[PDB]
Design a protein around this nucleic acid. Structure first.
Lengths: 10, 10
DNA sequence: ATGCGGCAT
DNA sequence: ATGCGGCAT
């Protein structure tokens, strides 16, 4: 996720 | 995690 | 050697 | 398969 908690996605 | 058990994240 | 999300890309 | 920190505990 995020950053933080990438994307989704990337 | 923290530094610390970066941030969440970075 | 820890310690976060659990999925749209 | 792909995508973030590179630590201060």
């Amino acid at each position: 996720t995020x950053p933080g908690v990438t994307x989704p996605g990337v």
